[PDB]
Design a protein around this ligand. Sequence first.
Ligand SMILES: *[C@@H](C)[C@H]1/C(=C/c2[nH]c(/C=C3N=C(/C=C4/NC(=O)C(C=C)=C4C)C(C)=C\3CCC(=O)O)c(CCC(=O)O)c2C)NC(=O)[C@@H]1C
Ligand SMILES: *[C@H](C)[C@H]1/C(=C/c2[nH]c(/C=C3N=C(/C=C4/NC(=O)C(C=C)=C4C)C(C)=C\3CCC(=O)O)c(CCC(=O)O)c2C)NC(=O)[C@@H]1C
Lengths: 533, 476, 43
Amino acid sequence: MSKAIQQYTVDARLHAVFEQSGESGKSFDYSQSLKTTTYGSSVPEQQITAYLSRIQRGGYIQPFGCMIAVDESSFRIIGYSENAREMLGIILAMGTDVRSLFTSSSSILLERAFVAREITLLNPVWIHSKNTGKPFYAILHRIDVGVVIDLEPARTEDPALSIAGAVQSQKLAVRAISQLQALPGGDIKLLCDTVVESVRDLTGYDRVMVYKFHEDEHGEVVAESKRDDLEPYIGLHYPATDIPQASRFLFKQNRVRMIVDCNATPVLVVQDDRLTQSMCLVGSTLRAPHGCHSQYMANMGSIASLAMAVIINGSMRLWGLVVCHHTSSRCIPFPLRYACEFLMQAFGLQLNMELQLALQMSEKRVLRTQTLLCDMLLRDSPAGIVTQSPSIMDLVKCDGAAFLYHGKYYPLGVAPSEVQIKDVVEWLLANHADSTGLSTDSLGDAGYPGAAALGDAVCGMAVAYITKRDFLFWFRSHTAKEIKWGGGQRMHPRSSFQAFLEVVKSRSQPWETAEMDAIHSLQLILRDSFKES
Amino acid sequence: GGYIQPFGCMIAVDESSFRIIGYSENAREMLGIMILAMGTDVRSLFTSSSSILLERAFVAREITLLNPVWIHSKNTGKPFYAILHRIDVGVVIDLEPARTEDPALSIAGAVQSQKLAVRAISQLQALPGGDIKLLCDTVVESVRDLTGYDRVMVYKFHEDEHGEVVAESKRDDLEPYIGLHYPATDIPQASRFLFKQNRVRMIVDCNATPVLVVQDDRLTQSMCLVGSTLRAPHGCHSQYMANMGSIASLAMAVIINGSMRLWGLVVCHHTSSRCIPFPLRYACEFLMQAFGLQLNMELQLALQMSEKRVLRTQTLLCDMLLRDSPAGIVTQSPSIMDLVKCDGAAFLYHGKYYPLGVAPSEVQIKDVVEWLLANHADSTGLSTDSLGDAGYPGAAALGDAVCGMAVAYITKRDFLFWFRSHTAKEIKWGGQRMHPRSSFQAFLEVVKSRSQPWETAEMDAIHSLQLILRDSFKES
Amino acid sequence: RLSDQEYMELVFENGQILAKGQRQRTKSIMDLYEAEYNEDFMK
Ligand SMILES: *[C@@H](C)[C@H]1/C(=C/c2[nH]c(/C=C3N=C(/C=C4/NC(=O)C(C=C)=C4C)C(C)=C\3CCC(=O)O)c(CCC(=O)O)c2C)NC(=O)[C@@H]1C
Ligand SMILES: *[C@H](C)[C@H]1/C(=C/c2[nH]c(/C=C3N=C(/C=C4/NC(=O)C(C=C)=C4C)C(C)=C\3CCC(=O)O)c(CCC(=O)O)c2C)NC(=O)[C@@H]1C
């Protein structure tokens, strides 16, 4: 059932384990929980439904702003955060008219915002508390039971200064986008580095880094701009379970999510007793992070956070994140968040450009290599495709290759010894004689009796059948060979790296669909050439 | 000095001393002063907070980082948006009155510019990513929704520098201009340079009387009223817009990678005077930036796919060459006509003529070969956009059917020809006085007997196939 | 046409994780701006 969709059960089980650890007064054993909670198995629909409700209908918000959910028509309050009375300087209770909590002009603007059909040009609204005059950004969104208003306090100053702050944030984002446009192109690493530097300059967080989500759904730190004294984290890989799939969905929903202080006490959202279930906070910008991620951030040493989703066209796909961490509490103004979202949209567009261009270039390179291989095979002996410079090892990304031809073994790079390759061929014939090739991440998981002997040097394989006895092999080493980072009960980045290395202990990198397509095309060409000889 | 549109005001001041060195005639009325005079401290014309903001903008290294300064007139208190830019002498301030006076609504609109830009760019993101026409149509619809102008169209500037209306969304009762072409001279190169510099050009009312900009007599040269957003349109373009029936205009440059290149424009026209508020203008500007980015993406992807298709065509032609005699390349479906965009092709092989599609007769092609030998004997290949311009005597005999012609040399007797007809063949549109119809007719006159230019990629493909066929002929 | 973002909730129904959505404009954004940003109420 896919990989992401299968991860929902693992997320639910880990969430339950964390909740039990909290209830019993124990400490969440991260490494043991990951080891015990593996993909597959069975989980009743009750558990997954409860996990989803607790994630999306937790009932707590961040104390840096307040929340008021009102009836769409009657403007009567159906829910409010416990800090709303203190935040607004305050009567506030169930059934109270929300228009009585703000000045007359603010109430009129709220009325105008509510009566909108599909799009409203007062969202957020700059409103003032009736009792104190405290300015707020009221960000409105619609939930099944009414309209939720996220009141984020705004700095008291001259309105010209607020407009100036918004203008400066947007112009910084525009300048960053202009810098992204004027790049050489065809280099994703340079794009990520430029975006990281621009985002750190724009937001001012202590640390800013880009996470790329792999087809496995695990994440990698592909870029970073940190404070000098802070520990580097570039090159770091962590399990897929560290960012639950529900959280990734919510990050696609909330394109810019801000956590002001992980150690701040969440504020309960008092709710009307007549509502069927807990209020939905999916769209709320004040939704508090679960204790799981709060504890993870506290252990990490990061207090504030600002995660911006990288969305590419794929019905959109979350290619990754751009997360800014701070060593102390940090709340940024809403205009700066929208400037960040605009910059992230530009980054997503250009990143999709780069990915498609890289796909085209890989196709062209594969075609050139195939043509050269055919030319050598036609005007040379078969060994010509392995004894010459553009050998089969250059067709796809691999740590080695091999050709078995009429009992002759021609290895290249890292390949099994002659006896080992005979054993592999015997296994393939015994168990996989009904196919014309197979791609394996790890020979150990595929059931090869002796993959341990090959060790970490040879983990993956992309054997292609040419005849009943002639074979083409492409070999890869375990992923940890190509992973280097300068660094497990506690939820800490080192624990995550160790757990990831445990997950991929005996697995190589996945065989990309394009690489297998290239292998199969080359296989068809070679089979056609040989069957006529 | 120069002239500005009466919908705003302009004051140019000395950067170091903030003393006014020039201003528009309507500045006093715009600011409610009707004091304002040469040498007056500009900070005395606005409130204290406005003066602080102006000073902060002045000392900024990159002034454009805070263009829209929200200031207030000291006399009337009305809000203005001051756009500040630098000139050779001092700083020019374009003061446009702000229709929204309520501070809360002003802040809300400032944030709504960002919100609307984000939503429009999100609409752009959802596109599959392999269709420029779809991108242009989406941008046109988004811009018309944001601004509400009667007409919104995308102009693409060809390699010739002439423009084509590649997309359009208009009022139902207006004449369509999609598919129209106009000469490159309709947009002077200076205007193109300005669109590259000042990405957004707004004309509120073409028929409004422009306002003179009086500058200090002590200034050596005329004030560089170039990057100003209030610059009045020239009489030529004002009369052109009046004739067209368009009173208001909002042109936005489409910028891609070239050093940046002006791919075209997204121009909004209105039948009556129009001046949309700043939040919508900036939402449109951000959407245009995102559109330029994605359009550069689409162009690069199109180049990659064109290269892939050309390589596949060459491979198929090689297979045909191996399978049979060379003439076989002009007998099967994947023929030389698929190598490059053309209206016809021809292969001369050992004195045998094999035409395809629109090609000249045997006598005409023999005459063409004789002309090529007489004038272009020492050549490995060539491309002509118009045979008449090159100097072929028989061009008139060929007519508009064959105007552009590309020759690839195989040997002294074997040739490959790619023939392309005149441009007006694939241009269709309904439609002296400066009018859209007159522009279209002038363009058709410019390209009367001229085909489309032969692209660099097309000639590279032709040369590659030429090399392959020369090697094959030498082998055979 | 442009519209405000609609937020969805994940639900586990029929053994599937479905992004079930929570819960018409004819005038242009400019007309909406003129309507909503009218200051007559401040007089
Ligand atoms: C006069 C001596 C020439 C001239 C000058 C001129 N043009 C522009 C800018 C534009 N001219 C456009 C006109 C066309 N051509 C068409 O056939 C057509 C139909 C759709 C249009 C809209 C054009 C596309 C622009 C920019 C868009 C716009 O602003 O409307 C300028 C710049 C003036 C300014 O913007 O400040 C000048 C000076 N125009 C002519 O037609 C003469 C040949
Ligand atoms: C519960 C046992 C798990 C948990 C839940 C959880 N994670 C997120 C989101 C993030 N957690 C990140 C993961 C890592 N892990 C690393 O190795 C690392 C980098 C050094 C980090 C920070 C991560 C990058 C995110 C995205 C947001 C962010 O970075 O702040 C969430 C949702 C976040 C939210 O509520 O905003 C939850 C609930 N985290 C774990 O690690 C546990 C296994």
